[PDB]
Structure 1
Amino acid sequence: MAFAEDKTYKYICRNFSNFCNVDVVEILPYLPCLTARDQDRLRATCTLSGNRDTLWHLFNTLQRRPGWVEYFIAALRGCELVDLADEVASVYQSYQP
């Protein structure tokens, strides 16, 4: 649900600092939900501002597509950030009926 998605995103920003390792350029191919465009923005942002900065735009960009959370859990798993994926899914499923 959107309410769950929205609460997830709120969690992530609560805890953004922990996430870091998340690699924007690595993570994007796993997010076909993002506009073929919006990836460019993130990917170009990263060149300019460095990863961890752009990470913030990406999540804000990620939470933009209904259904995004499932995409993301998949993404971290593609990124072998399994412990992180497990961390969000916990948060995510916590807000589902």
Structure 2
Amino acid sequence: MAFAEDKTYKYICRNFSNFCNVDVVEILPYLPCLTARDQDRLRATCTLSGNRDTLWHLFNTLQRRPGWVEYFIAALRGCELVDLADEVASVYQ
């Protein structure tokens, strides 16, 4: 699990611009691995810094909690970002 998650997080970082269509506020409802604290912090970050800058923090926070990749794949599908979801599933395998 660790190897696979680390690899996926590394891939998201190197390919960040693939993920800049992701809207932090829209994706949060599908990420139950994030705590209430995480969600409030990310909302504030978004308010202060904008969505693009917050995406980095979203990914950084996701990778700390447990069971993030499955939910991230789900969340991407929930937002109709199927190619992105498939690209994540592919790296996580």
**When the two structures are superposed, what TM-score results if normalisation uses the length of structure 1?**
0.91
Cα deviation, 1:16-40, whole Å, max 9, x if unaligned, reads: 1221000000001111111111111
Fraction of identical pairs, as percent: 100
Is the contact between residue 2 and residue 66 of structure 1 (CA under 8 Å) also seen in structure 2? no
Q: CA deviation at 1:66?
A: 2.1
The alignment's C-alpha RMSD in Å is 1.0
Q: Distance in 2 between matches of 1:8 and 1:36?
A: 24
Equivalence for 1:23: 23
Unaligned runs of 5+ in 1: none
Structure 2 residue 39 is the aligned partner of structure 1 residue 3: no
Unaligned runs of 5+ in 2: none
Structure 2 residue 45 is the aligned partner of structure 1 residue 45: yes
Q: CA deviation at 1:59?
A: 0.4
**When the two structures are superposed, what TM-score results if normalisation uses the length of structure 2?**
0.95
List structure 1 runs of 4+ shifted beyond 2 angstroms. Answer: none
**What is the number of residues matched between the two proteins?**
93
Is the contact between residue 30 and residue 78 of structure 1 (CA under 8 Å) also seen in structure 2? yes
Q: Distance in 2 between matches of 1:41 and 1:62?
A: 13
Matches for 1:14-93 after TM superposition, within 5 Å: 14-91=14-91
